[PDB]
Subunit: 137 residues, 4 copies
Amino acid sequence: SMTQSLREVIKAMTKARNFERVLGKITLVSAAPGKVICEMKVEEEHTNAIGTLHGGLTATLVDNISTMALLCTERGAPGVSVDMNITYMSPAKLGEDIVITAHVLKQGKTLAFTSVDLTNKATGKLIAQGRHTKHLG
Amino acid sequence: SMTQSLREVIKAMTKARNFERVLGKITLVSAAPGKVICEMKVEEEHTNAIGTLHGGLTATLVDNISTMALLCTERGAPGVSVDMNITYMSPAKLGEDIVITAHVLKQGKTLAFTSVDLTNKATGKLIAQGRHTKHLG
Amino acid sequence: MTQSLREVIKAMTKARNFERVLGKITLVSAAPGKVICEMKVEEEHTNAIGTLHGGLTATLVDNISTMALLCTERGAPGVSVDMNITYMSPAKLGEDIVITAHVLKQGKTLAFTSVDLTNKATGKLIAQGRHTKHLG
Amino acid sequence: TSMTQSLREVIKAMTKARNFERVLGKITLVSAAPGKVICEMKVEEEHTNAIGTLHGGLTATLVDNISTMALLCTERGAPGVSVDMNITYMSPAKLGEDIVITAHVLKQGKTLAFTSVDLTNKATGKLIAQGRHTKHLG
Ligand SMILES: CCCCCCCCCC(=O)CSCCNC(=O)CCNC(=O)[C@H](O)C(C)(C)COP(=O)(O)OP(=O)(O)OC[C@H]1O[C@@H](n2cnc3c(N)ncnc32)[C@H](O)[C@@H]1OP(=O)(O)O
Ligand SMILES: CCCCCCCCCC(=O)CSCCNC(=O)CCNC(=O)[C@H](O)C(C)(C)COP(=O)(O)OP(=O)(O)OC[C@H]1O[C@@H](n2cnc3c(N)ncnc32)[C@H](O)[C@@H]1OP(=O)(O)O
Ligand SMILES: CCCCCCCCCC(=O)CSCCNC(=O)CCNC(=O)[C@H](O)C(C)(C)COP(=O)(O)OP(=O)(O)OC[C@H]1O[C@@H](n2cnc3c(N)ncnc32)[C@H](O)[C@@H]1OP(=O)(O)O
Ligand SMILES: [Cl-]
Ligand SMILES: [Cl-]
Ligand SMILES: [Cl-]
């Protein structure tokens, strides 16, 4: 399964020394062609100085989970980031369960385009939305 | 001293249990009203799976260093992130020294606009540029 | 709501100001916080090489998202703070495009919207934008 | 310079068309140099929104076109096609105001080019908007 494989990727991230370690707490909900859903509980390690989800972590989720969606395509190339944007619509608080849903919008010869929504698991309310363009080598 | 105060903040960040810990390695060059310059050496903890500066860490640098520039204004409100964008123009390799320069572009009643350049310290070449809008206070 | 928006579109068509550059659009649906329009790409909409001009796409994102904001309880159009657009496929002269705008979140001072432009024939995304506006 | 003269004639020619490039007919070129272009424009009724300020979509159009001109003023000289563009709006440009649009090339490579554009009030220097624009070259 691409599900079995994405689980191994997440396991690898957890024990990493590099920056991939910061998402070690995420869990995989589903993988499908060009679509990945993960979930995460907001813990202290994920927060800023005021106890909400750090905007840089949100960016890191947008980046990594969209990259996972790209792994889940026929080409399966993760690429390198070219442009990313994130809009922050509601805070995510410590202890809240969040859902991160990534979709591939379009794949070309040298560029891929993805979108990510972070939502509150309980309410489905949008926390943030991001778009991420990657260059494929 | 504005620089000395901000240096102390950076030192505290280093000891944090929360996400602010991820920038523990940065050093402060200068603080002035609406302008902050930091430097960081890219180390393993900062990298992605291909050994370059992780795009989410770049995002976190844009976020935190622009927030520091807002702390260095008369109003001094850090705000909360509304929109951030980052463009990735060249990789920063493990062991490379980088400069992060943040400017406040405009401060209004309820919104502040900031921009950040990350450059290679040796060559001056642009690694990434971001813009970051925050809602005040 | 639909009738009001239809009239707005008629007014922009006849305008001397920049709102004129969309005169050629059709309202398909207006609902709470969601508007769907369509447009045939004509010469007036193209760049030097005859494809849909990126600034006109930007103008569609800006205007149609603002229309979605008009279709809310508050009904304030706001003023633009941040806009981004990702361009995925070209739209050629003569092609029909569907522009769908929706309100993601509304608050006291800020509103967030998203817009898709799609080729009607093929359903493929031409562009996607997001637009944050400040409310008075 | 010869470069400014060349670009000026490219602009005059391209803005006379029935196509969308016409909406920039009122811009004036100040200077073209390697990777950097400076234009100016007086905001008139045709440039405005329903509240009498510079229309956000025309600001985007200025960003797109003027950055593309900066790319033409390079050795590569490829205008490219837009991939990602963002704009941040800091202050209104009012009817009758002179604006300066300054575009510069940040970096270019084999297939991608990166540009940034500031719109400023000519008289006061203050920032109207700032955009960034990534284009695919081939
Ligand atoms: C059917 C009817 C529909 C018609 C639609 C027509 C309207 C749609 C057109 C539109 O979208 C215009 S968008 C054009 C491009 N964008 C801009 O020009 C936005 C520029 N950005 C800004 O002006 C600011 O950065 C702003 C977003 C307002 C910042 O907000 P904030 O920080 O909260 O406020 P400031 O500190 O800058 O200003 C506080 C307050 O004071 C006002 N003020 C004072 N003096 C002026 C002058 N001379 N001009 C304009 N405004 C002035 C500010 O406007 C602000 O007013 P608000 O309470 O509304 O924020
Ligand atoms: C150590 C030295 C100092 C260092 C400090 C550094 C800390 C930096 C913290 C930081 O930058 C956090 S950024 C995290 C990512 N961003 C976000 O989480 C922001 C998400 N977006 C939003 O919250 C909104 O979209 C908002 C920008 C606030 C929208 O603005 P507006 O429309 O004007 O506001 P709303 O109508 O949504 O909200 C009204 C107002 O009332 C509040 N509100 C609504 N609901 C709640 C709840 N449940 N709790 C608390 N407050 C609520 C909003 O907080 C808002 O307050 P203000 O406008 O006065 O700020
Ligand atoms: C299953 C588990 C495995 C999953 C692991 C996932 C790992 C994903 C990692 C990731 O996404 C890294 S993203 C980090 C942030 N982004 C960047 O660092 C990108 C910076 N931007 C660029 O490098 C350029 O702007 C680029 C997008 C490559 C520009 O494209 P283009 O114009 O086409 O290319 P260039 O002309 O710049 O370069 C051509 C070619 O040569 C390689 N190159 C050039 N210069 C360098 C330098 N200095 N160092 C290393 N490599 C260089 C370029 O990468 C490019 O190669 P490709 O043919 O592959 O495009
Ligand atoms: Cl934060
Ligand atoms: Cl990365
Ligand atoms: Cl406008």
